[PDB]
Amino acid sequence: TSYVPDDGLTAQQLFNCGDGLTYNDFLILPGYIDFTADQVDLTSALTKKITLKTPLVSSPMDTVTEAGMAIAMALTGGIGFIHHNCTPEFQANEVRKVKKYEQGFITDPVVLSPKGIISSRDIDFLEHDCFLEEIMTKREDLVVAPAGITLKEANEILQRSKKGKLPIVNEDDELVAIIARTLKKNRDYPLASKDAKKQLLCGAAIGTHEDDKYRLDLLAQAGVDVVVLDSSQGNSIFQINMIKYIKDKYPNLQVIGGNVVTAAQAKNLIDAGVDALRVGMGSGSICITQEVLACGRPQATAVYKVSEYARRFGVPVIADGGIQNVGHIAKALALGASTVMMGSLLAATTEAPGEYFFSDGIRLKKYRGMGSLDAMIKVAQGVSGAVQDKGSIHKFVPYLIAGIQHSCQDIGAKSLTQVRAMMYSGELKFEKRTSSAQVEGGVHSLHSYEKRLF
Amino acid sequence: TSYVPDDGLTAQQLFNCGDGLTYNDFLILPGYIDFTADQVDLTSALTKKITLKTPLVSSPMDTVTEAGMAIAMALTGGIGFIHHNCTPEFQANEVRKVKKYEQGFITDPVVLSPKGIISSRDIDFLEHDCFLEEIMTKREDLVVAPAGITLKEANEILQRSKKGKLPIVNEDDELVAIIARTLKKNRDYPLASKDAKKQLLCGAAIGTHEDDKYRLDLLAQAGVDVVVLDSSQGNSIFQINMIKYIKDKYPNLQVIGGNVVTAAQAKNLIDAGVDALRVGMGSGSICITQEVLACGRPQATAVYKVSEYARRFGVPVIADGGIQNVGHIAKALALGASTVMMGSLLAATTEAPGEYFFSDGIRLKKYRGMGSLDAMIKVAQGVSGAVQDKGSIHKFVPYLIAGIQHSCQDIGAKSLTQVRAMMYSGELKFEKRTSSAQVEGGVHSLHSYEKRLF
Amino acid sequence: TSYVPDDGLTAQQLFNCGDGLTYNDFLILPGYIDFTADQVDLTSALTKKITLKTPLVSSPMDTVTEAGMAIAMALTGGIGFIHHNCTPEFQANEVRKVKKYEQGFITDPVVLSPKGIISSRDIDFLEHDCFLEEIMTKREDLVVAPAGITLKEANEILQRSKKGKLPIVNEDDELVAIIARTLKKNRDYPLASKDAKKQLLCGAAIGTHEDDKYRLDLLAQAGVDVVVLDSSQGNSIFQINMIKYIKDKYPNLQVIGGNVVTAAQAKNLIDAGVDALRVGMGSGSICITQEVLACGRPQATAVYKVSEYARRFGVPVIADGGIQNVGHIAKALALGASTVMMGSLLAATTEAPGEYFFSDGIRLKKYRGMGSLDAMIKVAQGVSGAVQDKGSIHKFVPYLIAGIQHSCQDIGAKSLTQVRAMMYSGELKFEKRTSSAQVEGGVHSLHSYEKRLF
Amino acid sequence: TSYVPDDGLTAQQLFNCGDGLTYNDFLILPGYIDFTADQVDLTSALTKKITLKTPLVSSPMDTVTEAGMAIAMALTGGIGFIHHNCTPEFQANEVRKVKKYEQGFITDPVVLSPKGIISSRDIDFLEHDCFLEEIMTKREDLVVAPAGITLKEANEILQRSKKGKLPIVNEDDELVAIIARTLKKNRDYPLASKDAKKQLLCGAAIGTHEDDKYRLDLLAQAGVDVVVLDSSQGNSIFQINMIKYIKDKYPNLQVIGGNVVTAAQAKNLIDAGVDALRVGMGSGSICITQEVLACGRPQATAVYKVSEYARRFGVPVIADGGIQNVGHIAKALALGASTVMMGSLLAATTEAPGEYFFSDGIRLKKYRGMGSLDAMIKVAQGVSGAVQDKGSIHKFVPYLIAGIQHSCQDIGAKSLTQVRAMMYSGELKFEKRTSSAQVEGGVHSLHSYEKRLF
């Protein structure tokens, strides 16, 4: 015979009925492998105009994305969104801080007012004399460098002054930047996500309330590339206006639509004029909306449903919420999502806001939902907590990339663009997983065991 | 195109087959928001004649509703039902106590027999002399007030006597009431549930056994507004008679039908002449009937099924049992319920019967089913226990209201009347939730976390 | 209108497809109540010829049924089966012991050989002299009683001798029995299960292996009323022969067929000539067959399927295994079962074999499957353990009866015969229960709680 | 009537839709028993050319199969596969070591270089003198034996020298072997799996990467009988080539195809020229692929689907992964599998690699997946751990055999060949198991319990 039938379920019959299943409810039948995993191209679109080397994106939460994270993320190939739980000024600062970050050049030099350099030497010896400028008269005659400044002469010249951060200025003695030694052989970031001006990409979230139009402005000034509207149910006249307002004012600016879960919700945003859709309502580890409200939708189905529609307009979808492991990323992407947003899966990370604090013989790192009472009487829709400890976004992300690539390989696709083309064509196959199938899917029948991922 | 199909399940296909699903088995797809949550009107009917500002209702259990609770509940916009685990006299007392409660006026002044006022002063100094009247001859010549008594002159006049509870009498020196300082700026209860005589509404539960006709009488005297028949299976000739007996005797009185779960059970009660139906069999946190019997029905389905029928007669349905969180309330209401009754979700509360007693580094408050051996050889159908500690019904209820409103908003309804009109029309959409969907629905992927709701 | 549709699932569509559901997977919609629970008649058949006042039956396990249990059970209205884990002689003894038990008369007087009465007096005072008969010459001239012996003169006469167990003999000084004081006002057992000779009924289990034909014989002699073949898969040529062998030899004797789960398995036994069928394979608390084999079937479905067939021949079915609570009994009976057999649910009991032994601040009582390595290289198909502590079969059983009656009432049936007639007619309604429905079905949303059943 | 319908589900309708169920999701309805369990023949094929007495097969993991295991397994009637986590030389050694193992003859005599025998005597008395050959001049004149060596004269002759391991040599004083006393009455292995040269069978796993062709060679030399390609997704051009390469070079050699789960994946391997298929992706206790990727399939369905196809070509299927108990073996075999491979279920065993180390008052034995970071930045797809303690493969396996036989009996098949013929014909019946059915399936309703299997 040499036939072999067409066993396997198609996306349609699996996510277009009314059962409402999530990532852990299904699998993806393998295909034919004839290329190595690293040959898999993960290039994907974040918006109608922007494209990242990797589909990963950090969430706009006060415990996940902040300068450091938006930078690492961008450097590793993804992008980040600065949360909006702080006066517009500060949030806007985190943007410019990112938007004008340059290899080797000092991050954002801590500084003080006279109220010249100031090397520890002084601070030590010789009562706290009348202010700093006094206890520190660092003569104009000092080791500084001209605008011809470069990483080359920098470090080297630093040897003469045996210092590790010589200052640089344009012409009007107003520090443009300070080169720094601290790393000893900077790596190369070939996938770095940057804009036209070669600066790293940077996103930012804002509300849809009136007092957010000013906030947006400060961000816009700072060179923000894309902004996402923060809402649990983004299909409101408020967001729609907020959309129009922004698109009009700033034509040259991408706007991602508030969190939606239905094709109907999307229609309004795609019409308002959005550049993408953030799909996901009540899937976040810290989000507890479905339990305290009554509205929401199972992630896997939501991502599939909203993408199949959004695609018909060239509007990328960001699968936000529900990604509890590498696996769930490939899943979300295979269902129509162009990129995926993470929060908890990127909390412990060292680039994330906050500091670690061992608790009960185990590592730790704060992490809560922006809808929690702390982050914010108001009805709490989120919870507060903390997670373990992962490596650094510079090594963690690369691991995610390998997984996603290994996933694509097992399936038979050499790119994410293909994975989607396959599932929409009916070539990509799926299969439901019973509770026992889920149990067998993970670790079982062991007396004890540990786990290390990369 | 600009079409977007009609994705979404309708109530019918979801609760009218035979799967028997509960609140945690489904969700409600969001709609369009074009109004703020606080604009949502929660007005709902408790019976054919009565209407509350809020659909909340405390349960007739000896650990939930009692004077204090029936008062707070009424003040916050809902209503309460005094349990019937105590001689009719006492239960009847709790009613009048409620029915004639007035702002500022002392609750129910504790008192003693001679066997004039009696300020601590005496009790202290000068052997327990022959009875109270002796160890306390408080002269007729004392600070008291005339029927012109008002909160105005009251407190003020109290200053002269530097006391905090001057007595007031009509004419025949028989204390009608005592004004009291103890609060320092009473709030305003705009939603208060009151009757024609401007007195707070008050409900009361009674059995269907013969010896309950006298009990009902004492309650009726006390000015009870509505009574609910307490039974697990209320479709018995006993209740039906008890219905007729009451409707006849007291025409001007609402009667809620025993707990039912089917349209067939309802028919008998709607015919007997009930003013509402209490739907719910074996859903209560402390009820364990389904485990020790064989009869019952999944709450969500029961509420939907009995309401779709009851509505065809203008008979309100009270979704009693199964409400484990704010979310489940909106759910019950969206399925055809006019109001919802709670027990455990209103136990810890300070207005509830009993006192707290820290246990294992944690707060506590007794709570058990009226079907438990303690509350009541008889077959125990309930269990006994206790819960944590919530705020006060004066702040807790308001939180429930916000939730329910936030829920209605997310859906797209500006009132509960609308939410039901939407689900019966097919506009309101639902989606089943798999076990994984339920797991993703709540908190997951966190190393640890705490939870605060309002 | 006044119609009300026909909501509700019928047994057929619920247990005749291939889903394989158990008791916890469904419920029984209530009906109309017009009679009190105690008016419910539980009379049910155990075999084609025998009938018990109650459908309860103790299991033939070395930790459940033994003389004491087969007696209490019979007295409370049910029946018991002596296990066969002991030489035929001893098992046969437990039978006669039961079969000839009489109110007041000493159970089975412990005794010694000379190698007259022997009151402690002696044992105490005056070296262990040459044997008992010597250290105890209780003269012929002693307080004894004639065959006219009766509970009347007995106790009374005992006063004169101030003893508590005067001996009685026929004529040939061979103790027929000894009356005993130890209770102080024996109760009345109106439901007692007895045979023609007014003796309590008694069952007994035997294997189907060759060496079991002798064992059966000793039992037969002892006046056993019914015997059950002990097998996990009773549809073997071995049992079929064993059936024929017995039916032939002892026509006047009931034989219950080995454990089966299908209508096909039953056909062979009903033809071999059985008087009943023990349905249930791998449902017992201690049975772990399904996990270590590959054959078996979900109890609820098995009971329904085998009964619908067996009934077509007047062959009663004993729902054995899976009854984890009062509720599951009514369920099994409502599906076609005539009686139900229990093991674990009757372990802690005081009438059960073994003694209690507090462990970890909690009561205890051994309990294991006859298929366990201990009870019995052989493949273990059962496990060994222990349970808590229930009352006495004289109070526990009565509780089960109330439940079963309360269950029948809630449904609307005044007898078990009716409950079955209702489910087979399509009048009795059912509804599946989702996992959440099962969770809501039991205790939930409580911070803590205890449980007392009767 | 005497008909009895055809209740029961067929494999087809149960594993050929898209639900994806595992072993714990179904059962096998019993049939007719007319033969004893030990009469059941378990003979099954491992490949197109090879046949084992028992369908058991140890997995190629560095914690399961290694010489000792491949020997015991072969002796008990099955076969084993040496893992490939060690230079080809060593892995190849483990093969020859096995391939030339002979009863009584010393396993693999530990040895040292001069850098004659060497009995402890010396080592003790008389500074570590210049090397061994010196501190030990065991004269040529010593107790040794000629090629006529046999277990007969061996042991006996050993008495004269009162030693326990006399050396034997061919002619050129180059030890061919050493007979040893250490057991005191060697048993008989009637089912031993051997090749034409009467040597025990031995399998070995290799990768499909280029540098594996040399490795294969060393194994081939050592007399390996069958080799299995180690891959999670074995349907790649790499394996297909690796297949062709081997089949060509070594015609007289069996090759088992990489792990597959679909009929489509199989087609390529059956065409490449494989002798069997290893079905199973992400079912292993230590495999966590489905959780960190997105591809895989529920074992039960995979085994059924791939076998129904593979059989159409006479290509045996090895159900690898998911076997958590005796029961699951019969299940896998009944669905079309010819043999089953185990890992964890054969870890604790004494023949397995590694030594035990009590931990927390309990026994222990290391066990991890070859995909774990330890066994192997790379993406970890497995985990590391350890299990309890089972007996010895010489007693454990026999237990598995009894189970599998007991299973076959309960069904009604006298051989595995029959079990499959029955399920493909539609005679063998199945039934799904709900979560409650699964709960009832195992141990429940017990206050406590222990477990011993054989």
Ligand SMILES: COc1c(C)c2c(c(O)c1CCOP(=O)(O)CP(=O)(O)OC[C@H]1O[C@@H](n3cnc4c(N)ncnc43)[C@H](O)[C@@H]1O)C(=O)OC2
């Ligand atoms: C905000 O972040 C989230 C996100 C992204 C998600 C979830 C979530 O719970 C949160 C936290 C809660 O966000 P939100 O539900 O509070 C939405 P939002 O922040 O826009 O607040 C909405 C309310 O603000 C008021 N509002 C919004 N815009 C205006 C406006 N233009 N004028 C007046 N009032 C407005 C209304 O009361 C409207 O209901 C979730 O479950 O899935 C995704």
Ligand SMILES: COc1c(C)c2c(c(O)c1CCOP(=O)(O)CP(=O)(O)OC[C@H]1O[C@@H](n3cnc4c(N)ncnc43)[C@H](O)[C@@H]1O)C(=O)OC2
């Ligand atoms: C009473 O509260 C509940 C409620 C409200 C619920 C559940 C529950 O378990 C209880 C506790 C138990 O109530 P109930 O089942 O004991 C019902 P009820 O209190 O009316 O007692 C009923 C029995 O009393 C006797 N009875 C009732 N009325 C009469 C009568 N008129 N004459 C004689 N006997 C009567 C009968 O034996 C009838 O079976 C439940 O599972 O869902 C809701």
Ligand SMILES: COc1c(C)c2c(c(O)c1CCOP(=O)(O)CP(=O)(O)OC[C@H]1O[C@@H](n3cnc4c(N)ncnc43)[C@H](O)[C@@H]1O)C(=O)OC2
């Ligand atoms: C015995 O009790 C049970 C019961 C009642 C149940 C289960 C259970 O596991 C046990 C314990 C195990 O009983 P069994 O499976 O060992 C059945 P049985 O005691 O009859 O032993 C059967 C074997 O004995 C041998 N045999 C039986 N009769 C003969 C015979 N006539 N001649 C020769 N051999 C025979 C055969 O090897 C036959 O397979 C269960 O899962 O559901 C109900």
Ligand SMILES: NC(=O)c1ncn([C@@H]2O[C@H](COP(=O)(O)O)[C@@H](O)[C@H]2O)n1
């Ligand atoms: N409910 C809340 O308080 C809250 N806080 C954040 N979120 C949503 O959950 C997402 C993160 O989900 P996760 O941690 O990847 O499961 C965020 O991007 C945001 O959309 N929700």
Ligand SMILES: NC(=O)c1ncn([C@@H]2O[C@H](COP(=O)(O)O)[C@@H](O)[C@H]2O)n1
């Ligand atoms: N079974 C019992 O003892 C018992 N006690 C109270 N109840 C029922 O449960 C309801 C409360 O449910 P809950 O606590 O909101 O889940 C009560 O209103 C009553 O109808 N049941």
Ligand SMILES: NC(=O)c1ncn([C@@H]2O[C@H](COP(=O)(O)O)[C@@H](O)[C@H]2O)n1
């Ligand atoms: N597998 C075993 O060892 C074993 N031992 C007893 N049993 C079966 O289980 C039944 C008791 O079930 P349960 O305890 O009521 O769930 C017994 O009547 C018997 O049929 N099974």
Ligand SMILES: NC(=O)c1ncn([C@@H]2O[C@H](COP(=O)(O)O)[C@@H](O)[C@H]2O)n1
């Ligand atoms: N993922 C991993 O690291 C790993 N290691 C081994 N395995 C697979 O799992 C199988 C063993 O499964 P189990 O232990 O019987 O459930 C092995 O034969 C192999 O196919 N997988």
Ligand SMILES: [K+]
């Ligand atoms: K969630």
Ligand SMILES: [K+]
């Ligand atoms: K309950």
Ligand SMILES: [K+]
């Ligand atoms: K069981």
Ligand SMILES: [K+]
């Ligand atoms: K697994």
